[PDB]
């Protein structure tokens, strides 16, 4: 039975429900994602932000089963072409937009990648994607407006990769936390 998250608290309550077994019913985790309305006071200890470069705050571990962190992206501030490590990963707006153009994986033959689409995500829409569906960059168009996103990786996963659009190849990097459950980790 899935009700609808009253507050940051009772969504990350919810999916500790949805993530107590071996396996994960997307749908289910996409709608009780969506239908959480942002409420920027819930989320405020959280959105830490970078001047030259997005953010990855911790905010809940899953009790293992998957990580729950905010990213908070300056005017201008985009991710590389990436992967997700064979976890399923969900992505909701929590304020501003997000352009996600979405890729598909190389061939070995070096090449320029080209978008297969891109779409416009707005405040309080969840995204999902994972390694079989293809790879996607995430950027902050905007000028004017800072976005801060609500993402869930299932498994957690510390590293994957990164994709240059000129040729398709790979390289791993490896992610870190600018804060976790709101204290600053340097
Ligand atoms: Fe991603």
Same mark, same amino acid.
């Given at each position: 039975?899935? @009700?609808?998250?009253? &507050?940051?608290?009772?969504?990350?309550?919810?999916?500790?429900?949805?993530? *107590?077994?071996?396996? +994960?019913?997307?749908?289910?985790?996409?709608?009780?994602?969506? *239908?959480?309305?942002?409420?920027?006071?819930?989320?405020?200890?959280? *959105?830490?932000?970078?001047?030259?470069?997005?953010?990855?705050?911790?905010?809940?571990?899953?009790?293992?089963?998957?990580?729950?962190?905010?990213?908070?992206?300056?005017?201008?501030?985009?991710?590389?072409?990436?992967?997700?490590?064979?976890?399923?990963?969900?992505?909701?707006?929590?304020?501003?937009?997000?352009?996600? &153009?979405?890729?598909?994986?190389?061939?070995?033959?070096?090449?320029?990648?080209?978008?297969?689409?891109?779409?416009? @995500?707005?405040?309080?829409?969840?995204?999902?994607?994972?390694?079989?569906?293809?790879?996607?960059?995430?950027?902050? +168009?905007?000028?004017?407006?800072?976005? +801060?996103? @609500?993402?869930?990786?299932?498994?957690?996963?510390?590293?994957?990769?990164?994709?240059?659009?000129? &040729?398709?190849?790979?390289?791993?990097?490896?992610?870190?936390?600018?804060?976790?459950?709101?204290?600053? &980790?340097?």
């Amino acid at each position: 039975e899935l @009700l609808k998250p009253r &507050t940051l608290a009772d969504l990350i309550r919810i999916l500790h429900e949805l993530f *107590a077994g071996d396996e +994960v019913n997307v749908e289910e985790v996409q709608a009780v994602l969506e *239908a959480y309305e942002s409420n920027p006071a819930e989320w405020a200890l959280y *959105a830490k932000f970078d001047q030259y470069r997005y953010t990855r705050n911790l905010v809940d571990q899953g009790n293992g089963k998957f990580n729950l962190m905010i990213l908070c992206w300056g005017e201008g501030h985009g991710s590389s072409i990436h992967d997700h490590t064979d976890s399923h990963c969900f992505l909701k707006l929590l304020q501003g937009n997000l352009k996600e &153009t979405l890729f598909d994986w190389p061939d070995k033959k070096s090449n320029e990648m080209i978008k297969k689409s891109e779409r416009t @995500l707005r405040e309080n829409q969840c995204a999902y994607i994972n390694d079989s569906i293809g790879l996607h960059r995430v950027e902050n +168009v905007s000028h004017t407006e800072p976005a +801060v996103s @609500l993402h869930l990786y299932s498994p957690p996963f510390d590293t994957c990769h990164a994709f240059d659009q000129r &040729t398709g190849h790979k390289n791993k990097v490896t992610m870190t936390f600018h804060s976790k459950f709101g204290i600053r &980790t340097p």
